[PDB]
Design a protein around this ligand. Sequence first.
Ligand SMILES: CCCCNC(=O)c1cc(S(N)(=O)=O)c(Cl)cc1SC1CCCCC1
Ligand SMILES: [Zn+2]
Length: 257
Amino acid sequence: HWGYGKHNGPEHWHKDFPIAKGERQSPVDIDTHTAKYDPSLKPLSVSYDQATSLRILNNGHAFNVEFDDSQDKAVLKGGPLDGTYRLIQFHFHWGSLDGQGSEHTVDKKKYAAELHLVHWNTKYGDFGKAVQQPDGLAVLGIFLKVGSAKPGLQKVVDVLDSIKTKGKSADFTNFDPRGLLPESLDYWTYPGSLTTPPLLECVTWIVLKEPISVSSEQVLKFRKLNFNGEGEPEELMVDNWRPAQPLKNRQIKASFK
Ligand SMILES: CCCCNC(=O)c1cc(S(N)(=O)=O)c(Cl)cc1SC1CCCCC1
Ligand SMILES: [Zn+2]
């Protein structure tokens, strides 16, 4: 099955998932000089006041913090989007070292990690239908750099010991994802894809310019997770990122400057 190594990593995905070589794959390098400022783009509206986290899951590729998406409670709107997108889950991608880990890059700079808040377009009724549509998902991507701790991240970090291995989950209620956001909502946006199999070309990407800072101790806790299940040989969950893919016939737009 697919994963992050030499024989099952990103360079192999196209044999099971030929869209890997498609026209709107993610992530991409964000060449900041070439991105054009679009005065028609709106401020992003992030409305997370009523978010209901329920659980956290080690799915063997990353960990997902899941939300109750059965009512409009945590929604993304505005920005480049038409209509309303409901938060279903967030997860991260991170490196074995602080110098790598992000999926998107900014003028070829790789951040230590990248947070993905995944939302689906309510006009398609549920996530599984949304991923079959070119405007089905909106993913808010946020870079992480290592420096000062992110206090709003600590509840996540502290539960990771309980979900060390693939298939473990834990009650994870009352987590507020507002504590993972940077000060500015200035962003870049482009049409792309899921960055994991099945690599569906269903995502409007919204990548924030301002990274959040997390501490070395926080990211070290990410790197103690395992991609294996309990009772199997230990493979640290590190370097769970797909490299930048060809931009092809796409324009990256900036909400700023
Ligand atoms: C089997 C799932 C493997 C791990 N991937 C994800 O959790 C995932 C990653 C992204 S990303 N990295 O582009 O933000 C997005 Cl947008 C949606 C999904 S969940 C979804 C994938 C399609 C159908 C299965 C669940
Ligand atoms: Zn992701």
